[PDB]
Design a protein around this ligand. Structure first.
Ligand code: MN
Ligand code: MN
Ligand code: MN
Ligand code: MN
Ligand code: MN
Ligand code: MN
Lengths: 314, 314, 314
């Protein structure tokens, strides 16, 4: 199978500059070369160049609406392409607001996809419920069908079409949810595994249930949107919104190893890696290294080891 | 329901000065204000003023017997009072020796209560088995009924009446138990989940079993006496007796979230927080912050989020 | 029962000097004295003096073959001896290549023994599959019966006799396996629990299955060969090959506590402790301290506590 790396060095989805440097840091770490060592064919599409919308006045509270809306429109164009050629898209973030265009483009080709959102947040704030106008915490609001018309149209997002419903998404790792977001997920009945469910069940049983929930009836493509703050700050410290008591390095790898095993991975997002937020160079090395390790586990790298088929090592 | 914070800035239960500053640190951190944001009604009773017993000569090995005995007599007068008005008592420690008066007063109003003791120690050393005369490691000895008359009467504790039996208590997080204490718990058959049981079972199944053990037959009020060294030193470093290999931040919160769900929390003790033992300001912040987080989870704060009833956020 | 400490300050099994200092570090930490406090009789045999083979030319890729082969021939002589007097052998490493003579000598006296290998690696590289000629990553290749004649005879190892079969060994903690090694374990069908199985099952269920697998039919002596990099670098940083995402301090102790419980521990290897690889004195302290804690805990020290029999502490 083919893999296409897509760099989305974008940061207007939030106030902390630095996430744009994410793709570079991940490539600098040898992400592309390491992937080629796997059984997949790898093609690096390079980094997208995002045109900055001048005079991007805030829409009520929402900041940089047009810049974000445009960058995502361009990204969804690119993704919907690579998918068309039947390749697996891998988007290197920049902030999680780019999930809008990554999933949108993906859905255009595979309308029956389901999503597994690993994060410490929901990001289902609507332009009306955000305490801050930051879009990185609003991605899912723009995508769901149920939240259609429940908030005013935003400048630059008119091209967006709610592609997935509340039944097609599952959250894993939640631990920092605003009152508004919590109201939303409870009301729409969205399936989620907050850290307390993970503690109660064990990452093993959690993956078992997310699969039977999303793939029980129909086998469909899976879009894994991974926010790096999904794991505890001890493993991925260089992010903008670190929350204590998250997913361990082991639980994170377990999740990607399983998803690999389903053989249904299609889209993948490695978001929020911010190289400039590391207190020491080591914190940054730590962060990037796990991110790379996750990506790698999504495409086959097993902890138990790997050996090339047809090769008699004896 | 009503909540009553009661500060017990006491430290004579052990040699390291500093725990008396615990209540201040917890309030300074915004404990009371944060609680008011919960569905409970909060009333701060302030800090108790403990009269120092002059010429408090040690009883054999036991140090400051009268001072400790008196401070506890006063604290269980206060607790028995608030419980009488049907409010939930929350005691902010100093040292764990104050559990004597916290549980004594509580038992006066609710004689059928059961205890969940989170800690790395048992604190069931009797005045005859302690290697040190420190009372903070002897609380439970004075409470249980089975250990009645198995040790000489101590100066200042004649007011104490063994209120709970070996069947009404469960330990969680044990990892540093003296030979004597281990003899006692084995002999009296006290239910406990040391770190090895937690490793074997997983915090989820441990809470399941403590509940069926203590509430299987009769539903009764629960008194959660939380020693902050119950968690690993990496989360709560500012304590007097830190032991490595303890409960994680996640496991600690899991235990309080569950207890909240039983709807039977009646008394709570947040003990051993010593602000002066933090090697760096951050260590102290870390400690205080999770202590507050635990208290908050006992009264509803869920990791999956919270939303106010009857409020349509859309 | 009798215990015999045997120091193997050897390091030619790998390129990083320092592991020879392991035994001293462990003794300096009070390992022997602390053991005497247990119910076992302890005898320190001292450190073996290994004669250096001059002009030890590499065999193809394999480095220091003769020096390593000889040191192990001497070690297996010593071990086979103490076992013959019915005492439990405890080998303090240098590098894990010494497992060859530790297990060989042990098997001479107890041919029906089974092995529990805790490590992040397999070390089942054969002289033909190693990418580096380092022997510390080839121990198991020389011991297995199934891998007999699958590789050229190496200078100095002609005294070795494959003592255990693929059915007598279980790995726990794997997370860094070369393609060749992975081919080998899959082909020979060796039972293992990599970090993903530990995540899926929980250390509790893992130990349950390794026992039923190795002791289900016949109760036989157990040789625990512990590689200190088996735990995560956060607990045992001072090693030559640290791999992230390993066994926690708690899981490591759980494993030794269970093995003690079987009452079948016969041989024990505490390998790879390298005092010179600690970035700070604390890292080295940390490492040695848990190594000592594991050894203790192999011989009875329980987290729930210990009390001497027949002693009425009341
Ligand atoms: Mn996030
Ligand atoms: Mn996110
Ligand atoms: Mn304690
Ligand atoms: Mn305590
Ligand atoms: Mn190893
Ligand atoms: Mn090894």
């Amino acid at each position: 199978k083919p893999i296409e790396i897509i760099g989305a060095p974008f940061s207007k989805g939030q106030p902390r500059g630095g996430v744009e440097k994410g793709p570079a840091a991940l490539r600098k770490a040898g992400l592309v070369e390491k992937l080629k060592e796997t059984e997949y064919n790898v093609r690096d599409h390079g980094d997208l160049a995002f045109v900055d919308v001048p005079n991007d006045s805030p829409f009520q509270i929402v900041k940089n609406p047009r810049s974000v809306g445009k960058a995502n429109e361009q990204l969804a164009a690119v993704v919907a392409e690579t998918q068309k050629n039947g390749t697996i898209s891998v988007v290197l973030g920049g902030d999680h607001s780019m999930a809008i265009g990554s999933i949108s483009g993906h859905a255009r080709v595979h309308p029956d996809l389901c999503v597994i959102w690993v994060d410490a947040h929901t990001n289902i704030n609507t332009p009306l419920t955000t305490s801050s106008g930051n879009l990185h915490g609003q991605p899912v609001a723009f995508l769901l069908k149920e939240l259609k018309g429940k908030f005013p149209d935003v400048p630059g997002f008119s091209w967006v079409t709610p592609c997935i419903s509340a039944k097609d998404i599952v959250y894993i790792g939640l631990r920092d949810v605003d009152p508004g977001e919590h109201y939303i997920i409870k009301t729409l009945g969205i399936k989620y595994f907050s850290m307390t469910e993970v503690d109660k069940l064990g990452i093993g049983k959690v993956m078992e249930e997310t699969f039977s929930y999303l793939l029980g009836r129909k086998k469909r493509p899976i879009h894994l949107s991974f926010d790096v703050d999904g794991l505890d700050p001890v493993f991925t410290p260089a992010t903008g919104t670190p929350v204590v008591g998250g997913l361990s390095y082991r639980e994170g790898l377990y999740i990607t190893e399983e998803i690999y095993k389903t053989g249904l991975l299609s889209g993948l997002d490695i978001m929020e890696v911010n190289p400039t937020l590391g207190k020491t160079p080591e914190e940054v090395t730590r962060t990037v290294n796990t991110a790379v390790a996750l990506t790698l586990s999504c495409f086959g790298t097993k902890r138990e080891g790997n050996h090339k088929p047809e090769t008699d090592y004896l």
